[PDB]
Amino acid sequence: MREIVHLQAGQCGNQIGAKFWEVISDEHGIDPTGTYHGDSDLQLERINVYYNEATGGKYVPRAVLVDLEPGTMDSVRSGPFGQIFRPDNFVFGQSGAGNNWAKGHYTEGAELVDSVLDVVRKEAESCDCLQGFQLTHSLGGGTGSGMGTLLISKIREEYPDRIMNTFSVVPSPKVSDTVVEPYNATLSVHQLVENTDETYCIDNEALYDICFRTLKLTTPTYGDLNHLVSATMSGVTTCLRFPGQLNADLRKLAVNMVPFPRLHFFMPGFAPLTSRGSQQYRALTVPELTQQMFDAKNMMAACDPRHGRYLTVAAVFRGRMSMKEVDEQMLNVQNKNSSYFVEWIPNNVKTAVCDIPPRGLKMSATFIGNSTAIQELFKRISEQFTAMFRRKAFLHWYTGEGMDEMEFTEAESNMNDLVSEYQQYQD
Amino acid sequence: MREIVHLQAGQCGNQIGAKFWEVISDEHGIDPTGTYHGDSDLQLERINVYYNEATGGKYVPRAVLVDLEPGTMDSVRSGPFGQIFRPDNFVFGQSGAGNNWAKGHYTEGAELVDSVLDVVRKEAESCDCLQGFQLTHSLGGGTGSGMGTLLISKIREEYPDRIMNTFSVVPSPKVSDTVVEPYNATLSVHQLVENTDETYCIDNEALYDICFRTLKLTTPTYGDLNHLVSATMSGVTTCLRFPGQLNADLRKLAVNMVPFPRLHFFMPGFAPLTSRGSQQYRALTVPELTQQMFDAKNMMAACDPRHGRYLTVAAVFRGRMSMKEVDEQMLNVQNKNSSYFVEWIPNNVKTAVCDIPPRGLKMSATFIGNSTAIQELFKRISEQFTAMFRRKAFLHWYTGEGMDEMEFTEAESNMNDLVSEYQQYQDATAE
Amino acid sequence: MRECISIHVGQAGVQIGNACWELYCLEHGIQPDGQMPDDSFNTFFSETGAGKHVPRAVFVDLEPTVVDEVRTGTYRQLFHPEQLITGKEDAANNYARGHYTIGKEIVDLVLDRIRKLADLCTGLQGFLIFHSFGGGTGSGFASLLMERLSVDYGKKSKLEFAIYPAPQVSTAVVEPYNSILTTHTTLEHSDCAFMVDNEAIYDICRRNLDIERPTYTNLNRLIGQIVSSITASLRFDGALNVDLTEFQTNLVPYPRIHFPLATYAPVISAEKAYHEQLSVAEITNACFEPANQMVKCDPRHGKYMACCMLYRGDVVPKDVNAAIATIKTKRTIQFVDWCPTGFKVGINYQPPTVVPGGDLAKVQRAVCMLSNTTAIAEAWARLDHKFDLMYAKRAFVHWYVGEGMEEGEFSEAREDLAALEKDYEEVGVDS
Amino acid sequence: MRECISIHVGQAGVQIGNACWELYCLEHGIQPDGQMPDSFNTFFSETGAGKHVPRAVFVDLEPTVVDEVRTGTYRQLFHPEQLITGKEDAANNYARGHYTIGKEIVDLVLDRIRKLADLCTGLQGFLIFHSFGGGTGSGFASLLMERLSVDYGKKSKLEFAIYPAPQVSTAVVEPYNSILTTHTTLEHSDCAFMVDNEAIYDICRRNLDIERPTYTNLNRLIGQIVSSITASLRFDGALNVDLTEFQTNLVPYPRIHFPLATYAPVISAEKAYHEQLSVAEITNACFEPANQMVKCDPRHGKYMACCMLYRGDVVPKDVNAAIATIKTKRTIQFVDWCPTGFKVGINYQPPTVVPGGDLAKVQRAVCMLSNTTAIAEAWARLDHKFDLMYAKRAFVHWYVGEGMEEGEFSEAREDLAALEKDYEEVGVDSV
Amino acid sequence: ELTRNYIAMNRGAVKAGLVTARENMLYRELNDIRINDQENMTFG
Amino acid sequence: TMTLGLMRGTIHRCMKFNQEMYVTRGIIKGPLLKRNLEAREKLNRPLVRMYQRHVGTQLPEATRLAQGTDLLTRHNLHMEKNLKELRTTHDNLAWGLNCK
Amino acid sequence: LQQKWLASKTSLKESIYTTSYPRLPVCAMSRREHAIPV
Ligand SMILES: Nc1nc2c(ncn2[C@@H]2O[C@H](COP(=O)(O)OP(=O)(O)OP(=O)(O)O)[C@@H](O)[C@H]2O)c(=O)[nH]1
Ligand SMILES: Nc1nc2c(ncn2[C@@H]2O[C@H](COP(=O)(O)OP(=O)(O)OP(=O)(O)O)[C@@H](O)[C@H]2O)c(=O)[nH]1
Ligand SMILES: Nc1nc2c(ncn2[C@@H]2O[C@H](COP(=O)(O)OP(=O)(O)O)[C@@H](O)[C@H]2O)c(=O)[nH]1
Ligand SMILES: Nc1nc2c(ncn2[C@@H]2O[C@H](COP(=O)(O)OP(=O)(O)O)[C@@H](O)[C@H]2O)c(=O)[nH]1
Ligand SMILES: [Mg+2]
Ligand SMILES: [Mg+2]
């Protein structure tokens, strides 16, 4: 019908994916064994979209889990939902990449992609009408930044037509856990722009903000940080899976979102976020949701949108609501903040509705934005990459893998040619 | 009716027959004493194909186990299904051949042939209408590859019309437990190709990867090795014993798979092969049965058909299906992999249906396909035979048995003539 | 009175006779024992002093396992044991075995068995003969039975219901050889033809009846509806009755050309029947779409030269002509220049019954058409393409000559199809 | 009567010829030997042996290209001096084929055409084929017109010519030759038929669905257009149109003699099956900008004159209904001084179809020839390409070393500055 | 030598009526087929 | 083996050439039950009896069907003899092959 | 759906003939309204 194959690479992607496959496991009413224990028919009418039919009333993921280092996959197999992912969907090498993009993309990335290209091809012909592909990784590591993008270069040659969405994890400058990150980031962003329909720039600093100030969590670990990405995961496809007043899918937003193919770097958000103290004295209504999207505080990107102009903005509402308030609020926020939108596109705001709210909640929303201020992140990778390329520092880890230096030169050339044409559109 | 006399030669042969007779006794519900403890009625309707009746509601198989070494019979007789075989059917000699093809074929096999020929004739005239015989052996041995070739070469003259099958085991170049096995290999194929109706080349090397990689057994013993071949032998005579929607038999695949008398070499396959972690995560359906049939990882032959062309293909499905999805998948693999099919024969795929699923399972199918890529098997054997024969090595073993030197030369010339015949059919213009 | 002897041959014939005679028993009320719990049944059933009725059929097959499931089935006491006939060995997709080595052993038993049934019949209208071209017994032995059936009775009608090789899918490889070497001989000794391809019925069932995974019985059930409406005029009363002699007269303008093309309507599900009004106009147009044809041939590619119409159920003589009035006033349907009036309407009172466990819904009216055209001549052409590109290398023929017989029949059969295809063109041209 | 002589220049025309006369030979009914087992007189000439020599000449500067013609199937069809060949080429150097290499062969060419010209009695026009890229197809063709102009002052000389494509190019030095080429087709021609391979590439990809064609497939369409042009001459029709008439009805001013051609329908057999074709259907296809053979957008300009050449089974009543529809459309613009802008041509004989060809046999077609101001922008894209090369004096030393003064480069560019500005101001409505 | 014709030879054996493999090769030895192809009127 | 093999063509050409005469004979003789026959084919048709009203009008058809079976039954007896002889030179060649 | 997956794991050995052709009810026999004799 319209099926998604969920790709999963790197340590980060392996974890948020297990986190992502926890929410859509919770909502669809399927127990950790593999059997459906929900209540309503609507929960199982479209489950072909993420789950594959298997004998005995049991469903299995359309998920491919890849990691060069086998250390992490034992943890995914040993979580609460570790009895759901097929072992043949696990494919692993023996040695990690050591946080080198070159190794994961050229030397040991070659021997594994044939395995990954095989199983996705098995899942390519398994369903009848695929809607697209969807991947999670990190540009700051060695495998997801590396072999994760190698698949992107390969699957785009195999299936040009299908939409490709990437929920990638962009490194933060104020908090850095890797010095060869501005290398691997420079060498993956270059690989993203030509072969990707829509990129969701996720970071970790802004997520550390959100729990601290919006949720007042005293010890926010990686697990709670993984909760919010999985929330935004289901909100993107909350319309494809269910009925509503105004349905949508991945393609309807994407064509409404990309005026020129070089601009597909986004800025995702999640609405109902308040403290554990305020679980009673806080009204769950349409306008207070809209008041929560368009702050710079709820945002899980590493940029302040007030420094740029929102090109296009999409709001996907979840749950049942009367419609008139949304067009009133989305129009209202357009009029008052008229200086923060580009004039050359009218009616900048996109609205879609599903009728079903998520589990344990009455109303939900997801906001995906293309704005100028995403340029502020890309200039400052080059602010770090130039400082490390000019002294040729840490370089010999890369030239030992057979690559040249010109790839480093042309990678900076392509990002420079991205922001330069990105800056003209703000002015 | 339509009976089979199970021939059996060699230590390789005697073990497989013990294992092969296990799975049929289990399916027809036969306990080791021989009685029927099954539940259904179709489980005893065509039992007479394999089993002879004995007094007290007892069935004994129509098997003739032969060997040149006395110690193998005792190990067979000491197994679980030991006292199920009639004791007189064992034929064993006092002296063994010892991996030499010559000793088993002229010197010591010539004293044992008359005794087996007494036994097999009694079992041949026992049944009214024999469908045919069937032998299992290895071509690296001394008795199965030796006297066994002399065994077949005789009874072709006695019973010309009857069907001859051989689940022969040809030695692999990558793994070998013999130094002299090409001499056993080359001097047996020439006798084989003259007198046999069809063949199946099951190589222990290929089954080693399949348990290595697909079933993922930590310790795949020869028992786990010979469980896969036993399912293959059962999966050819399956429509003979059970009713189906579209039946088949030994002859129907025989007439439909061999365009010319010299080409009767097939690469068999088995579809339901899944490891334990894959038992949970599977939806056993017809496309998932077909997708495993055509990937060359599944084959029990030591040659990749991707380097050759599928001359003819036969597939026998076991279970209760909709034969629409039987006919859709075979047509699809015909058109997608069109380059892997010869063009002067249209619709190279042959199908049949057997309703009764294999016991403990629901869906299964067996594959019998003739390709020209098995020429890769023969040229590897002649790669080594001429390597040894140029130095006249190991020859005093053979010359002292009374044979002549030219017989090596003619058997290689025939072997080279076959690979010059198959190869030309690869590069053959349809128009 | 009217009588019809069914002469089903082969696994196709037996499994078709399984479906048809089940519908017949519900149609006249016979229990599986053989009793009614007026004399409309005499054309199919017989009489004994105790009121027991036996069917006038002869299930013949050269292999056992097709028909032993009938002997042990629900209707095990309905049939004479003598009526069902079995040989020990089959032909196995070999026209030659079933016609020149295996047929003559069994032809004299079947023929004598035919004689007693036709002795019981005083006035026999026609012989109904169902077989297939793919199988060996349905092609080989059946061609021999026709040959000696004609010499038993010069006149008696011999209808030929047939299973044809499908243009794309195939259950056999050597299947052209039987098909070409069959119509060369049965041409002399047949009076009508009803070739239908399981591919085209596959097309209809999934598209119209919402069964994505049918079985051979589902195709078998539709065939039973076709044979019901042909003979329905003989059985029950009607406005314009029609006999086998009658439609035969208004369907073949030349003895050379006796290959009609049958069609049924409506074939719709009860969920699709609840919401849809069915009128005589609506069902008669559905008989003319190519998507409802049961031969993979498009009458738009040819020209109708004879049409026979069978209305059955709640139909009125007034509305029949108006549907025919509109059908004639369309230029996408063509006729030869030498056939302005090419219709023959039969009107019957009884609506057809339904079989629970079937697929068709209960409807009050139905049509059956038999349109002889030249759009069928393209089907022979595809057979010649496949046969000639196979006979060039002369594959699989060693089975045919090695069984027995000649090689000269092989050359003579192919060109006779060139004449037949050429003959259809002389009808195709207009003066 | 009417007789036509062809003067194929360079590699382009000779391969253009091979498709043309192979179409012409099957148009009339000749055999490759040159005999028929008087519509041919325009194109063939009767000889002593009763053989028909085609009124053609090939002029080429390299031996291999026309050697293929002298060795092909049509080797005996043709007269050897008509295959005129040169030892050494200009190698895409307009200076060489105009000043150095042509002058060794100029007078030989003029001999052979006059000998065929003396055979004819009444001449109407010379149909010559060349390109704007190659040296021999431009430089040699340039000078021969200048002599042919003073040898035949009144005779017509059509210009079927290849325009270098806007994007895809098989050479680098094409724009220098083309800017030098235009003066010949400007002061020494009466019509022209410039076309790029790119648009012919698109229409084959978009409509003919052939994703991998060669230079034969494009050439098949070119001959079909010429076949439509001369169909009035060869065969009778309701409204026969000679070339001088086509010349009269298409050229507004002496300078502007650049028609654009268009053929509808160009449709494969599979797409022809589901699409009925009408007179109204075909005339709309000619005005779709997607099917234009030149990469210019007619909707960016307006039409000054159009020539229609309908062919096959067409009726004048449908033509006017087709014509009246085209007027009632604001998408199609006409210049204000053109109240009526059409030349309607009717023939009886449908265009043929070549075996191994691409177009399906359609009972009705149409040709099109429009003089629009759309083609103005094509030259401005050529002028820039020449401009950005000439300022830095790229490649000039090759032509200067051959012996043209460098001022001729500037003088030629002024002409296209002159030619383009005439198009723009003519397009301006004086209202 | 120039190989042997393993298609024409088989077709000839079939036409003669030799079906068993031993008889097929005996016919080969009898009639090997090897591809030797590997190497005045005035009109005016 | 050659002459034995080349005789499989000569053996097999003879039973069908014998078998065709077996079916060709019965058609001329006609159906075994005259009630299965009774139609336009008999020699007592209404057409012929009408013609029999005039004196001296009869049929010679009932003797040409005799001469049709004359050569047909004769040719089978010569054909059966040549068949039976040709089996003896098949078994005797097969037996002598065994001794060789 | 519960029935569609519950009716999978059964020991359903039987010929398709015997699972397809059972004993029909005597109520569902044809009434044979239109017939020739009196
Ligand atoms: N439509 C339809 N076709 C059938 C049926 N049963 C068999 N066939 C066709 O019969 C062909 C094979 O011939 P069979 O009837 O099965 O076997 P046979 O006629 O006894 O001939 P042998 O196989 O030589 O014994 C297959 O290709 C089927 O297409 C049936 O029930 N319905
Ligand atoms: N459509 C078409 N174009 C051709 C063909 N042959 C040559 N051309 C075009 O002619 C241009 C170059 O001139 P050619 O015809 O190849 O050779 P030439 O005319 O003898 O000129 P020289 O090569 O310099 O001798 C190329 O750019 C082609 O586009 C042809 O057969 N069909
Ligand atoms: N958002 C998020 N980031 C994580 C998580 N686990 C690890 N990371 C980040 O991933 C980066 C290291 O990625 P790495 O495992 O080397 O990627 P790989 O080399 O492609 O496998 C670190 O900077 C971490 O901050 C997680 O659960 N969530
Ligand atoms: N597949 C398989 N191969 C076997 C088995 N037993 C022995 N072999 C092979 O058979 C060969 C030895 O056969 P051998 O005893 O010499 O045969 P014999 O001389 O006829 O008795 C070895 O190469 C083994 O690999 C078995 O149970 N299964
Ligand atoms: Mg059969
Ligand atoms: Mg050239």
**Chains G and D, touching by 3 or more CB pairs within 8 angstroms:** no
Residue D231 CB partners (closer than 8 Å, separation 6+): D237, D309, D311, D347, D349, D351
Question: Could you tell me where the beta strands, DSSP code E, fall in C109-217?
Answer: 126-130, 157-163, 192-196
User: DSSP class of residue C73?
Assistant: S
Within 8 A by CB and 6+ apart from D270, the residues are: D209
Does the beta-carbon distance from B424 to E6 stay under 8 Å?
yes
C169/B243 Cβ within 8 A: no
Q: Do F27 and C150 touch (CB under 8 A)?
A: yes
| Three-class secondary structure assignment of A191-259 | HHHHCCCEEECECCHHHHHHHHHCCCCCCCCHHHHHHHHHHHHHHHCCCCCCCCCECCCHHHHHHHHCC
Burial pattern A24-62, b for ≥16 Cβ within 10 A else e, equals bbbbbbbeeebebebeeeebbebbbbbbbebeeebbbbb
Quote the minimal CA–CA distance from A409 to chain G in Å.
58
Question: Which amino acid is present at C354?
Answer: V
**Calpha distance A243→C115 (Å, rounded):** 70
Judged by a CB distance cut-off of 8 A, whether residue D35 touches chain E is no
Six token digits for residue D419: 């030619």
Q: How far apart are CA D373 and CA D299, in angstroms?
A: 10
On the question of a cis peptide bond just before residue C81, with omega within 30 degrees of 0, the verdict is: no
Question: What is the distance, to the nearest Å, from the Cα of residue A141 to the centroid of all Cα atoms in its chain?
Answer: 16
Contact status of G4 with chain C (Cβ, < 8 Å): no
The CA-atom distances, in angstroms, between A105 and each of A116, A145, A149, A187, E34 are 14, 8, 8, 10, 55
For chains D and E, count residue pairs whose Cβ atoms are closer than 8 Å.
4
**Å from CA of A81 to ligand 3 middle:** 20
Q: Which atom of ligand 1 is nearest to C90's Cα?
A: 25
Q: How many angstroms separate the CA atoms of A135 and D231, rounded?
A: 63
The encoded tokens of residue A415 equal 């990002």
- Per the DSSP assignment, residues forming a β-bridge with B51 are B61
Which ligand is the nearest neighbour of the Cα of C10? 1
Phi, psi of C399 (to 5 degrees): -65, -40
Closest residue in B to A61 (Cα–Cα): B281
CA D247 – CA D156 distance, rounded (Å)? 9
Alpha carbons D39 and D48: distance in angstroms, whole number: 19
Structure tokens at D394: 């790229």
The CA distance from D94 to D61, in Å, is 13
Buried b (16+ CB within 10 A) or exposed e, C18-48: bbbbbbbbbbbbbbbebeeeeebbbbbbbee
What is the rounded distance in angstroms from the CA atom of residue C24 to the CA atom of residue C34? 12
In angstroms, the CA A120 to CA D300 distance is 48
User: Structurally, what CATH architecture does the domain formed by A375-425 represent?
Assistant: Orthogonal Bundle (1.10)
**Are B145 and B139 within 8 A, CB to CB?**
yes
Q: 3-state secondary structure string, chain B?
A: CCEEEEEEEHHHHHHHHHHHHHHHHHHCCECCCCCECCCCCHHHCCHHHCEEEECCCEEEECEEEEECCHHHHHHHHCCCCCCCCCHHHCEECCCCCCCCHHHHHHHCHHHHHHHHHHHHHHHHHHCCCEEEEEECCECCCCCCCCHHHHHHHHHHHHCCCCECEECCECCCCCCCCCCCHHHHHHHHHHHHHHCCCEEECCCHHHHHHHHHHHHCCCCCCHHHHHHHHHHHHHCCCHHHHCCCCCCCCHHHHHHHHCCCCCCCEEEEEECCCCCCHHHHCCCCCHHHHHHHHHCCCCCCCCCCHHHCCEEEEEEEEECCCCHHHHHHHHHHHHHHCHHHECCCCCCCEEEEEECCCCCCCCCEEEEEEEECCCHHHHHHHHHHHHHHHCCCCCHHHHHCCCCCCHHHHHHHHHHHHHHHHHHHHHCCCCC
How far is the alpha carbon of D47 from chain E, nearest alpha carbon, in Å? Answer: 7
Residues near B110 by beta carbon (within 8 Å), at least 6 away in sequence: B150
In terms of CA atoms, which chain B residue is nearest residue E14?
B260
Tokens of D130: 């060349």
List all residues 6 or more positions away from B22 whose beta carbon is below 8 Å from its beta carbon. Answer: B80, B81, B230
According to DSSP, residue D47 is labeled -
Q: How many CB atoms lie within 10 A of CB B153?
A: 16
Disruptive mutation site among G11, G13, G18 for chain B (greatest number of B CBs within 10 Å): G13
Amino acid, res. D57: V
C345 forms bridges with which residues in the sheet? C309
Q: Which residues of E touch B262 (CB under 8 A)?
A: 21, 24
Angstrom distance (rounded) from CA A9 to CA A12: 8
Report whether residue B333 contacts ligand 4, using a CB cutoff of 6 Å: no
Closest CA to A188 of A160, A230, A151, A233: A151
Q: Does CATH number 3.40.50.1440 belong to domain B3-257?
A: yes
Other residues' Cβ atoms within 10 Å of the Cβ of residue A360: 7
Helix (H) or strand (E) holding A92: strand A90-92
d(CA D141, CA D185): 10
At C198 the three-state DSSP class reads helix
- Specify the DSSP class assigned to residue C123: S
Strands D52-54 and D44-46: antiparallel
Resolution value (Å, 1 decimal): 3.5
- Do B281 and A88 make contact, defined as CB atoms within 8 angstroms? yes
SS3 content of chain D, % helix, strand, coil (to 5): 45, 15, 40
Who's near A41: CB < 8 A, 6+ residues apart? Answer: none
Task: Tell me if C394 and E20 make a contact (CB, 8 A cut-off).
Answer: no
C-alpha R_g of chain C: 21
Q: If you measure from the C-alpha of residue B77 to the centroid of ligand 1, how many angstroms do you get, rounded to a whole number?
A: 44
- Is residue A356 within 8 A of residue A240, CB to CB? The reply is no
Does the CB atom of residue B328 touch ligand 4 within 6 A? no
Q: Do the beta carbons of residue A403 and residue A340 sit within 8 Å?
A: no
> In one letter, which amino acid is A30?
I
> Would you state the structure tokens that stand for residue C231, as one six-digit string?
């003979």
Q: Please name the residue whose Cα sits nearest to atom 10 of ligand 1.
A: C12
- For F39, list phi and psi in degrees, rounded to 5: -170, -160
- The answer to whether the CB of B141 is under 6 A from ligand 4 is yes
Closest CA to A315 of A273, A282, A271: A271
CA A226, distance to chain mean position in Å, is 12
Q: For residues B199 and B204, give the distance between their C-alpha atoms in angstroms, rounded to a whole number.
A: 16
Best A64, A85, A88, A92 member to test B by mutation, with max B CBs in 10 Å, is A88
DSSP state, D346?
Answer: B
Binding-site residues of B, in ranges, read 11, 69, 138, 142-144, 204, 226
Residues of F in contact with C405 (CB under 8 A): 12, 16
Measuring CA to CA, which residue among F8, F93, B266 is closest to residue E14? F8
Which ligand gives the minimal distance to the CA of D91? 2
C225 marked among binding-site residues: no
Cβ <8 Å between C148 and F41: no
* Residues in chain C, total: 431
Any idea which residue has 């008669």 for tokens? Answer: C284
D376 lines ligand 2 (CB under 6 A): no
Half-sphere exposure of D307 (CA within 13 A, CB side): 27
CB contact at 8 A, A140 and A171: yes
Which residue type, as a one-letter code, is found at position D281? E
Cα end-to-end distance, chain B, whole Å: 44
Residue with tokens 């280092």: A69
Q: Which two tokens stand for residue D255?
A: 């300078």
D41 annotated as belonging to a binding site for a ligand: no
Residue to substitute from G15, G17, G20, interface B, most B β-carbons within 10 A: G15
CATH of domain A265-374: 3.30.1330.20
CA distance D361 to C428: 19
The answer to whether residues A105 and A147 touch, using CB atoms and an 8 Å cutoff, is yes
Going by DSSP bridges, is the β-strand pair B130-134/B3-9 parallel, antiparallel, or unpaired? parallel
Structure tokens at C428: 């195709």
CA dist D286 and D369 (Å) reads 9
CB D164 within 8 A of CB D209: no
Task: Using only the alpha carbons of chain E, give its radius of gyration.
Answer: 19
- Report d(CA B239, CA C232) in Å as an integer: 38
Contact B229, B167 (CB under 8 A): yes
- Nearest Cα residue to D321 out of D291, D283, D348, D277: D283
Using a 10 angstrom Cβ sphere, with 0-12 exposed, 13-18 middle and 19 or more buried, the burial of residue C392 is middle
Q: Chain B contacts of E4, Cβ < 8 Å?
A: 417, 420-421
> Which two tokens mark F32?
């075994």
Task: Tell how strand D344-345 and strand D364-372 pair up.
Answer: unpaired
As beta bridge partners, residue D128 has: D159
Q: How far is CA C135 from CA B97, B243, C98, C174, in A?
A: 47, 17, 10, 10
Q: Which two tokens stand for residue A173?
A: 């400058």
d(CA C128, CA C244): 10
Chain G nearest-CA residue for A59 = G5
Confirm if D122 and D2 have CB atoms less than 8 A apart. yes
Does G1 sit within 8 Å of A56, measured CB to CB?
no
The one catalytic residue in C246, C282, C409, C421 is C246
Element (H, E) at C119: helix C103-120
Ligand nearest to the Cα of D93, by number: 2
Given phi > 0 = left and psi -120 to 50 = alpha, else beta, which region is A318?
beta
- Would you say the C-alpha torsion B253, B258, B264, B269 has a positive or negative sign? negative
Q: Are the beta carbons of D14 and D139 closer than 8 angstroms?
A: no
Q: Domain residues of chain B, as ranges?
A: 3-257, 265-374, 375-425
The reply, when asked if residue C364 is annotated as ligand binding, is: no
E38 interfaces chain B, CB cutoff of 8 Å: no
Last residue before each gap in chain F (C to N over 2.5 A): none
Do A175 and A208 meet the contact criterion of CB atoms below 8 Å apart?
Answer: yes
Q: Using CA atoms, how far apart are residues C287 and C266, in angstroms rounded to an integer? A: 8
Is A165 annotated as contributing to ligand binding? no
State if residue D219 touches ligand 2 by the CB under 6 angstroms criterion.
yes
Residue recorded with tokens 């005259």: F34
Residue A382, amino acid: S
DSSP F27-63: HHH--SSHHHH-STTSSS-HHHHHHHTSTT---SHHH
Question: Alpha-carbon distance B357 to D379, whole Å?
Answer: 76
| Residue A121 DSSP one-character state | H
